[PDB]
C-alpha cells in the first residue's frame, strides 16, 4: 500500500494484448459494423473474416488487430495460438467539421467524423 | 493551543436594527415584480401632473418675500439668563444666530 | 466585484439529477426534464400518504368479510355486532385475525350473532 504516491512508483501500469488506432478517418458508426463480427473470437478468424468482409473499415480494424497481436506476443510473451479477441470497440475522436454550399445561398456543415479503433487480445484457454 | 476564535476586532457586532438586508426581487420561487403589466423598464407616469386638481384650481395671489424677522421670544430672556447682555451681539451665544435678517 | 455562479449551479443540479433514478430516459439524464418530472412528483408523493391510508383500510375491509361471509355473516353485519358488544373493539388487526387465526376469527364471528339476534 503505502499511499497513492508510492504506488505510482512501485508500479508502472501496463496493457496486456492491447493496441489502438487513434484517429482513423472513418465514422465510428461505420467501423463498428465490422468491429462487431470480429468481437470475441479466434484472433485467427478475425484475421480471416477481415480479409473477406467487404466494408472498407476492414483495413484499419485489420491493422489494429495485428498490432495488438504483435504485442500480446512480443511485449507480453503470450502464446499466439490461444489468443482470441478478448475485447474490441470504437470510440469517436475529434470531428472534422467542413462547410458545404447549398441551394440559394444557405450553407451546411458536413461532419467528417473519425474513430479510435482499439482492440484487446488475450489468451483464451478453458481452465 | 486548544481552540478559540478570539473576541475583539472580530467580536465587534453590529447593533441590531443598525442595518437590514437589501431586497433582491425574488422572494420564494415566484417573483415577477411590479404590477402584472402596464408598467416597467421606464419612468414617467410620475406622481404629479397638471390636470389632477393642480390645474383647475384658482390663483394668482402674488409672492413678495419682504423681510423675515428673528423672533426672539420673551422666555428666552426672562425666566433664566441673568442679563447676559442683549446689545446686538451676546444674544448670538445666548442663542439666536440668525444673521442676514 | 465579479461573482460567477461556478460550482454553485452544477451542484444544485446534481441534487435533482440524482433524485431521478429509474426515471426513464431524458427524465433521468437531463436536468430540466428530470427536475420538471419531480414537480408532478410532488403531487403524487404528498397526496399518496393522505391516501395509502385510504387504500389500506380497503384491503382490511375486503378480507374482514371474506371470512365474515365464510360463516354466514358479512362485514356490514359482523362489524356492527362486535360493535353491539362495546366489549369487542379491535377493527384494527381484525382482518389479520381473520386471515391467520381461523380458530379465533370464528369466535368473534359467532360472538356477534350472539349479540345480534
Amino acid at each position: 500500500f503505502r499511499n497513492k504516491k508510492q504506488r505510482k512508483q512501485q508500479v508502472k501500469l501496463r496493457k496486456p494484448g492491447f493496441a489502438v488506432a487513434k484517429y482513423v478517418r472513418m465514422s465510428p458508426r461505420k467501423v463498428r459494423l465490422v468491429v462487431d463480427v470480429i468481437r470475441g473470437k479466434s484472433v485467427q478468424d478475425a484475421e480471416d473474416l477481415l480479409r473477406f468482409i467487404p466494408r472498407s473499415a476492414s483495413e484499419p480494424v485489420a491493422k489494429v488487430l495485428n498490432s495488438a497481436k504483435a504485442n500480446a506476443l512480443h511485449n507480453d510473451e503470450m502464446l499466439e495460438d490461444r489468443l482470441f479477441v478478448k475485447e474490441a470497440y470504437v470510440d469517436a475522436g475529434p470531428t472534422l467539421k467542413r462547410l458545404i454550399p447549398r441551394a440559394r445561398g444557405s450553407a451546411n456543415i458536413i461532419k467528417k467524423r473519425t474513430s479510435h479503433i482499439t482492440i484487446i487480445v488475450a489468451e483464451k484457454g478453458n481452465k | 493551543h486548544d481552540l478559540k476564535p478570539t473576541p475583539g476586532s472580530r467580536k465587534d457586532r453590529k447593533r441590531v436594527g443598525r442595518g437590514p438586508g437589501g431586497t433582491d426581487k425574488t422572494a420564494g420561487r415566484g417573483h415577477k415584480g411590479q404590477k402584472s403589466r402596464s408598467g416597467a423598464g421606464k419612468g414617467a407616469f410620475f406622481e404629479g401632473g397638471r390636470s389632477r386638481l393642480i390645474a383647475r384650481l384658482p390663483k394668482r395671489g402674488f409672492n413678495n418675500v419682504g423681510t423675515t424677522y428673528e423672533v426672539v421670544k420673551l422666555s428666552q430672556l426672562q425666566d433664566l439668563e441673568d442679563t447676559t447682555f442683549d446689545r446686538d451681539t451676546l444674544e448670538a451665544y445666548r442663542l439666536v444666530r440668525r444673521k442676514n435678517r | 466585484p465579479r461573482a460567477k455562479t461556478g460550482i454553485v449551479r452544477r451542484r444544485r443540479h446534481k441534487k435533482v439529477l440524482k433524485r431521478a433514478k429509474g426515471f426513464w430516459g431524458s427524465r433521468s439524464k437531463q436536468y430540466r426534464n428530470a427536475f420538471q418530472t419531480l414537480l408532478n412528483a410532488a403531487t403524487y408523493e404528498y397526496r399518496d400518504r393522505r391516501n395509502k391510508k385510504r387504500d389500506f383500510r380497503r384491503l382490511w375491509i375486503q378480507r374482514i368479510n371474506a371470512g365474515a361471509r365464510l360463516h354466514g355473516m358479512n362485514y356490514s353485519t359482523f362489524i356492527n355486532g362486535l360493535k353491539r358488544a362495546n366489549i369487542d373493539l379491535n377493527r384494527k388487526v381484525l382482518a389479520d385475525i381473520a386471515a391467520r387465526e381461523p380458530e379465533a376469527f370464528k369466535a368473534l364471528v359467532d360472538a356477534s350473532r350472539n349479540a345480534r339476534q
Binding site: - | 420561487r29 | 403531487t43 358488544a85 373493539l89 388487526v93 380458530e103 368473534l108
Partner: protein, 94 residues
Amino acid sequence: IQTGGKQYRVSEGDVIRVESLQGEAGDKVELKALFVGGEQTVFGEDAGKYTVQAEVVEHGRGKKIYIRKYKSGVQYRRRTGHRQNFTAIKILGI
C-alpha cells in the same frame, strides 16, 4: 394501533409513539383487547382481566421524510423536512 398496543404475541421489541416515561425498564402496562395465552381466545372486557407488561427500550427519531407540496401554473412549490419520534418497547406482559 392508536397508541399502546394490545392483542397477544410472545414479547417482541416493537416501536410506537413516544411514551413519555423516558429512561428504560419503565415497566409499561397496556390493558389488552384480545389474545390467546394458551390458545385461549379472549375478546374484549373479558380480556381486560389479563394484561400486558412491556418495558421502554429506547427513544427514536424516525427516518427523515421530505414533505413536498406542489400546484401548477400558480407557481407554488414547498420543501420541508420531517421525521416522527417514537419509543421502543419490549413486550412481556401477562
